[PDB]
Design a protein around this ligand. Sequence first.
Ligand SMILES: COc1c(F)cccc1C(=O)N1C[C@@H](C)CC[C@H]1CNc1ccc(Br)cn1
Ligand SMILES: CCCCCCCCS[C@@H]1O[C@H](CO)[C@@H](O)[C@H](O)[C@H]1O
Ligand SMILES: CCCCCCCCS[C@@H]1O[C@H](CO)[C@@H](O)[C@H](O)[C@H]1O
Ligand SMILES: CCCCCCCCS[C@@H]1O[C@H](CO)[C@@H](O)[C@H](O)[C@H]1O
Ligand SMILES: CCCCCCCCS[C@@H]1O[C@H](CO)[C@@H](O)[C@H](O)[C@H]1O
Ligand SMILES: CCCCCCCCS[C@@H]1O[C@H](CO)[C@@H](O)[C@H](O)[C@H]1O
Ligand code: NA
Length: 302
Amino acid sequence: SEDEFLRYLWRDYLYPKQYAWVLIAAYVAVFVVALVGNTLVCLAVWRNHHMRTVTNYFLVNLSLADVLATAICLPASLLVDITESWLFGHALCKVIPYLQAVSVSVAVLTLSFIALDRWYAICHPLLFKSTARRALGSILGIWAVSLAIMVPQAAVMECSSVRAFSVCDERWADDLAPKIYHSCFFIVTYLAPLGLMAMAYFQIFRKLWGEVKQMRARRKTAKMLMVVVLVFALCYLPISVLNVLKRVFGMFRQASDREAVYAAFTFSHWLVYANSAANPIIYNFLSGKFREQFKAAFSWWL
Ligand SMILES: COc1c(F)cccc1C(=O)N1C[C@@H](C)CC[C@H]1CNc1ccc(Br)cn1
Ligand SMILES: CCCCCCCCS[C@@H]1O[C@H](CO)[C@@H](O)[C@H](O)[C@H]1O
Ligand SMILES: CCCCCCCCS[C@@H]1O[C@H](CO)[C@@H](O)[C@H](O)[C@H]1O
Ligand SMILES: CCCCCCCCS[C@@H]1O[C@H](CO)[C@@H](O)[C@H](O)[C@H]1O
Ligand SMILES: CCCCCCCCS[C@@H]1O[C@H](CO)[C@@H](O)[C@H](O)[C@H]1O
Ligand SMILES: CCCCCCCCS[C@@H]1O[C@H](CO)[C@@H](O)[C@H](O)[C@H]1O
Ligand code: NA
């Protein structure tokens, strides 16, 4: 029974090995590309004074939130996605999930303020002054808000023993509280800002593609930014939806195909980190100015 042997070889050995190879290579490729890429974003804006715009100051802040998640949270997520257990202790069970939620909040708030800045500059000019100095005040305000509103997330994280292994999970005293919290989390960090940004960029699209030199520069930046928002919305959609289906709709509680649930959650966690790697790649192709600084970086160190 050679066919039956090959089927158990595939199930018990070949498939789990290929799965671990794909998983580890995917997480390592994204960790490296995100660390290098986002460092280069910060260096491109620091080196060239002409790219020291309000948009690019917020793009640097997006890179900081993306570096926060890549450096601290990505290695922890990789180990949970391998073991399905917590190996970093009780203290880090509160800190790493908290820093991850802070990073999402900083990322989406940074995107909202870029949209807001572009919407006032293009659709409703001369009502609100937007300068580089005021961008640093708005950036500090983004961190202060994000650090505060994510404390409930830190408060619910618990590291509990289950063999003798630990699990880092949210502890809720009653069934109603996680439903209200995960509904609010989804609408505040995903749905409401992305719905508002889509409507703002649709208005900017109508104004720009409906002075000539300025509109040529504005069309290039608005095209890039629309691609960034679209890619953020696609990357954060599977995790945002899985968290609602789990916490609000009580899904994935049956263990019949536990491995299928782990794979959907793993791929969803990886898409969040893939976003940090994606943003500097988007600036490379949709910004000639970021393209120059990146081309100069590969000419120098490589
Ligand atoms: C974007 O969300 C996550 C991620 F990208 C990696 C791992 C987990 C998540 C996640 O589902 N959440 C829940 C959400 C309501 C707040 C943000 C995180 C917090 N939980 C975490 C985060 C990191 C690690 Br590692 C373990 N748990
Ligand atoms: C950049 C330097 C690398 C640091 C990586 C952090 C990993 C933490 S190990 C972790 O420490 C806990 C105490 O905090 C113990 O409870 C755990 O048993 C142990 O596994
Ligand atoms: C920048 C604002 C400062 C707040 C940062 C929150 C993360 C601290 S870790 C964690 O927070 C939980 C919630 O408060 C407590 O239950 C724990 O005892 C404590 O270890
Ligand atoms: C509108 C008012 C909003 C406040 C609601 C507070 C309800 C408490 S939930 C409770 O919080 C603890 C924090 O320490 C966790 O340890 C528990 O696991 C979790 O169940
Ligand atoms: C704005 C926030 C709204 C989010 C959606 C949550 C709706 C709760 S359904 C509700 O859950 C209770 C606790 O689990 C049960 O006692 C009830 O039988 C059931 O009807
Ligand atoms: C702290 C108090 C906790 C109470 C939790 C109950 C929440 C109400 S859910 C609501 O209950 C209705 C009953 O009239 C049903 O008709 C609806 O279908 C259902 O959605
Ligand atoms: Na991000």
